[PDB]
Amino acid sequence: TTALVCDNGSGLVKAGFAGDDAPRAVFPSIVGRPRHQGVMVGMGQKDSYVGDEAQSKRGILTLKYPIEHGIITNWDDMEKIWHHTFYNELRVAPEEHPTLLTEAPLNPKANREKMTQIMFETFNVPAMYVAIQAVLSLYASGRTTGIVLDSGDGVTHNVPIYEGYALPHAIMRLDLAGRDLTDYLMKILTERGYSFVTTAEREIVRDIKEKLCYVALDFENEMATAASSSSLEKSYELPDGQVITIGNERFRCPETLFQPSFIGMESAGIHETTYNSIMKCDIDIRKDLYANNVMSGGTTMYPGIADRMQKEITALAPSTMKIKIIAPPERKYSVWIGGSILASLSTFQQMWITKQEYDEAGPSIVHRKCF
Amino acid sequence: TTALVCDNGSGLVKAGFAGDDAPRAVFPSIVGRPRHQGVMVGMGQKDSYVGDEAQSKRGILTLKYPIEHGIITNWDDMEKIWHHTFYNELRVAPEEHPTLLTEAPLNPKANREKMTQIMFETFNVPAMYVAIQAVLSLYASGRTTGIVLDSGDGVTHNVPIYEGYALPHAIMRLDLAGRDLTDYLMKILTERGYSFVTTAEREIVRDIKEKLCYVALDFENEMATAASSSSLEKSYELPDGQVITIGNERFRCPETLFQPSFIGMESAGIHETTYNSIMKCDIDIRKDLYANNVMSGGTTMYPGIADRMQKEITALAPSTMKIKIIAPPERKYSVWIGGSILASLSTFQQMWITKQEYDEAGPSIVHRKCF
Amino acid sequence: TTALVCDNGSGLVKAGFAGDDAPRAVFPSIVGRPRHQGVMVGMGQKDSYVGDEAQSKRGILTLKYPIEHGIITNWDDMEKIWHHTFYNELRVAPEEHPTLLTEAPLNPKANREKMTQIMFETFNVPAMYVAIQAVLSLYASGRTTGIVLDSGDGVTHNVPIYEGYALPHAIMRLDLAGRDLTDYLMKILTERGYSFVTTAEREIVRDIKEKLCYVALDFENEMATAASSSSLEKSYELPDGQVITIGNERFRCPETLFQPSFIGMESAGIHETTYNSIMKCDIDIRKDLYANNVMSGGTTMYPGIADRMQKEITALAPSTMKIKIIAPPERKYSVWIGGSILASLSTFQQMWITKQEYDEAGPSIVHRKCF
Numbered sequence A, B, C: 001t002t003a004l005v006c007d008n009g010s011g012l013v014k015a016g017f018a019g020d021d022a023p024r025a026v027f028p029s030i031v032g033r034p035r036h037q038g039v040m041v042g043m044g045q046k047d048s049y050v051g052d053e054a055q056s057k058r059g060i061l062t063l064k065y066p067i068e069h070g071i072i073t074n075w076d077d078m079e080k081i082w083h084h085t086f087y088n089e090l091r092v093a094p095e096e097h098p099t100l101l102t103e104a105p106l107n108p109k110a111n112r113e114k115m116t117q118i119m120f121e122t123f124n125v126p127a128m129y130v131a132i133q134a135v136l137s138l139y140a141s142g143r144t145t146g147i148v149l150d151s152g153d154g155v156t157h158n159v160p161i162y163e164g165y166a167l168p169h170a171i172m173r174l175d176l177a178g179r180d181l182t183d184y185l186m187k188i189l190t191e192r193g194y195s196f197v198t199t200a201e202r203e204i205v206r207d208i209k210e211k212l213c214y215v216a217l218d219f220e221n222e223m224a225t226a227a228s229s230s231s232l233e234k235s236y237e238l239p240d241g242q243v244i245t246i247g248n249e250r251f252r253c254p255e256t257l258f259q260p261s262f263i264g265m266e267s268a269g270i271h272e273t274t275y276n277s278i279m280k281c282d283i284d285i286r287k288d289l290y291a292n293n294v295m296s297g298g299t300t301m302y303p304g305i306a307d308r309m310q311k312e313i314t315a316l317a318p319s320t321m322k323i324k325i326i327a328p329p330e331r332k333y334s335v336w337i338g339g340s341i342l343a344s345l346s347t348f349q350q351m352w353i354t355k356q357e358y359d360e361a362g363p364s365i366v367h368r369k370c371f
């Protein structure tokens, strides 16, 4: 039958059936519990809400994110998220569908051990498999050679591949993601007097970040222009009728990706990370990786990130190379699209982990089979 | 000439001269205007009163604070308060003495912009400077490495410093301080039949709070003791001659610091704020910050506050670490003492913002010369 | 006059006087600068910190190493380090003492050219000499025959010397050293949850490696045993009282020496490289090199490394030969010890490059005199 492809992101959940062109159900990965006191009978029920029905009620809920930087911290909540996706979104009983999850590179082993343990023990899936996200992103584009940048809500990592032969000694992982951008935005917005303090208001700040932010091609010059003129201002309207206006915050926020010292981090931005990853491979294949620089992840949707990366990576490499950022319009869902492509290959059906093997080897087999 | 220090707090204006060890003047920051029609000739002058001459007469006045959570909400009254200070209380022509002011972190820029503009244009002080309250509080103790929990009247913030290099990425600020506790105290006194509603009677409940309230080392145990005994109850007499009595209110009111969910807020109490601030820092410097939990501000005078914070953080942090709380006896004027020390340093005389610089750059200078 | 000796290694500086027993000062070579912004007047000085003091304050600094793979990559900082070693650790006037140095084999000539230039012109030392490290190592053992293995922090090299005649073609230089092992340990410590990314955390991962890691005597059996139980597990406490546990990460890191493919390289482990070095020398002298096998360098201090090397070499060479690994307990400082021995020999005082000869011939004379 058709196997599920559930891409549990750090902030979003994508689910669907192998082969399709787009995820069937997409909903945020949060769980909210009421905090005030219910003074009425038979109303205000359901001690816990998940996804959209926790977004719409968020005003009176305290919203938790089960995953934290690509690591599942609250397993009791993650079981709930998976239950939601399997039953209330997809409307399937997973006991007849194989599954194909995803993980970030360099993620702690116990994370995926417990992942597969739950999948086999609670949901009784006949077989399943766990694939790194960079490999799926590289499938989606339909090629074999390139270096993936996959920047999501929890983790930003890079993975270079040459003709199907991975180079695990060049994979670099940098935990500066969309969540940290939103949490820095909440802090900088006070400079104007708009105090967002609650977990609910954090979703409002995420919405402002998605709607209005954009990466400056040249940070210093846009600083000067924005300070010297009001042509860069823009206004947002809160759910309660208020109106908030923001000026240079719009590009001050995404710039954290390229200058992690804005939030105290010591690393070098994503551009330097990619350059270092490419300069760690063999000398012959650096030329090809310079030319097939793939992008992915929702966080790479900031208008102008492709051009800023092009600039900041052409400034580094030798002047005789062709540095070519690939930025598909659907790069938000490239991981899932790659997963769906993968699961439908006939020659991949011998890479599943069958329930029979799990019943005979324990969860540790996930390492002896998967990547 | 000698530099003045004017720590125009939210509850009490502390104004004095650099080089001294105590403020030359303390008075409430309230401006009241009468409300009952006058009927006598030879009277009825001076429609507005400030400070103590408004506190005494409040029987016939409506009192209003100009600062609201460390943000000035009505400048027309703040000019009046500064004028009162300089001319009637300190009695110095301000245009012959530099002045040093204090501002809480994450405070909107416009606040300090107008703060500088008023001083330079109206009072024409030859020079001035604005400093964050936590750094002055650190100066007051003679240290150079600690984490300062300043709980003023409006705002409670937390600024970890290590060897003089502050760590802005890990600062906190919780809008929960004196006035909120006074409001909660008024709200829970109603349970006994004491209905205070007016702006005058809030200045009776504030005194009740300052006299009878304390902090419980174990809130549940105190609740049980109150339920099963009358030992905790205490007696207080109103201005007109009535006597009131309050029981568990005494330790309920300050408990709102550690469980903000009492007054509805999502945020976490002061102990969790401090632990989060310490953790965010570099792993090698948490050791020293654990042992320098300085305290300041008026609201940090409740009995049992230092001991309670000691217990809480010692319960949160790793068991091996030595947690210490530093609560100097005069910690109510810690910020003013810090400013007094700072204004005297010879190395500091170069950091004044001069009137010429203000003319050269205007209000935007305060974002370069001052922290 | 007395001659100084300074083994400018990659990871640590071993300085001191000729003729002594042990180095006078052994301080890490790192020039750090503060990354945060100071706020407190009255302290926060000394824009850069070098060596020990840099290690002490590394909580708020970025630590860069001036030497990388035994080639001075940053002269601005190496000059500061030399100035420190002379004027604050040895506390001597360098202009009065002949100064010996060291350099790895097959090291670019511009390196030592500028080394001699700086020593003769900036410090105005009277005479100097750049002796290859392995030869000094072999002096320190008293021998005059054998095959030196010296695994510094940056570079690993073999130098077969027979009867005082160094055979230059059989030399081998392998850029696998301590820092590579540190980085690989940092990489494989993510398998349990940890994240050491800052340059400050490199100086803690190196210490975990120095304290716990050990070489296996048979890697496959070690892995099989480790998988069986938790007997091998050991626990180490970070600077802030948090405890971490590691199992097979203790001996997967040192195994990089004997299977360089772990960190992505192609070349064969140190044992195959030594066997290949011997098997390029004349047949008449392979017996003498087999039975004399000197060790050196800090990285050769893993418990059991000598035994593993002996096993692996005997596994290749003909059965008749008697292999012997010489591992003096003081081998970490062998290079400096040999330098001090050499600087004292009466026959040596003619090898000096005098200031007059430097003036006559320029920097290039160090190629014609120094081996």
Ligand SMILES: Nc1ncnc2c1ncn2[C@@H]1O[C@H](COP(=O)(O)OP(=O)(O)O)[C@@H](O)[C@H]1O
Pocket (backbone or CB within 6 Å): A008, A009, A010, A011, A012, A013, A151, A152, A153, A154, A177, A178, A179, A182, A206, A209, A210, A211, A297, A298, A299, A301, A302, A332
């Ligand atoms: N159009 C957009 N522009 C900018 N940021 C966006 C946009 N859409 C989503 N984001 C941000 O990217 C993150 C979600 O992207 P996503 O790829 O799904 O993360 P994850 O790996 O967990 O699945 C969120 O932090 C969100 O704020």
Ligand SMILES: Nc1ncnc2c1ncn2[C@@H]1O[C@H](COP(=O)(O)OP(=O)(O)O)[C@@H](O)[C@H]1O
Pocket (backbone or CB within 6 Å): B008, B009, B010, B011, B012, B151, B152, B153, B154, B178, B179, B206, B209, B210, B211, B297, B298, B299, B301, B302, B332
């Ligand atoms: N001994 C005390 N106990 C409890 N609350 C106090 C005490 N002294 C002052 N307060 C309260 O703290 C506030 C004033 O203290 P203060 O430190 O000066 O605040 P601010 O930051 O505005 O300067 C007032 O609300 C006052 O009621």
Ligand SMILES: Nc1ncnc2c1ncn2[C@@H]1O[C@H](COP(=O)(O)OP(=O)(O)O)[C@@H](O)[C@H]1O
Pocket (backbone or CB within 6 Å): C008, C009, C010, C011, C012, C013, C151, C152, C153, C154, C178, C179, C182, C206, C209, C210, C211, C297, C298, C299, C301, C302, C332
């Ligand atoms: N007992 C030990 N075990 C393992 N590694 C060690 C030990 N002592 C030092 N090292 C490593 O050796 C390196 C420094 O040794 P060293 O020989 O002096 O290098 P260099 O020649 O540049 O001076 C460091 O990276 C350190 O991690």
Ligand SMILES: [Mg+2]
Pocket (backbone or CB within 6 Å): A009, A010, A133, A152, A153, A297, A335
């Ligand atoms: Mg993702």
Ligand SMILES: [Mg+2]
Pocket (backbone or CB within 6 Å): B009, B010, B133, B150, B151, B152, B153, B297, B298
């Ligand atoms: Mg205050």
Ligand SMILES: [Mg+2]
Pocket (backbone or CB within 6 Å): C009, C010, C133, C151, C152, C153, C297, C335
């Ligand atoms: Mg060496």
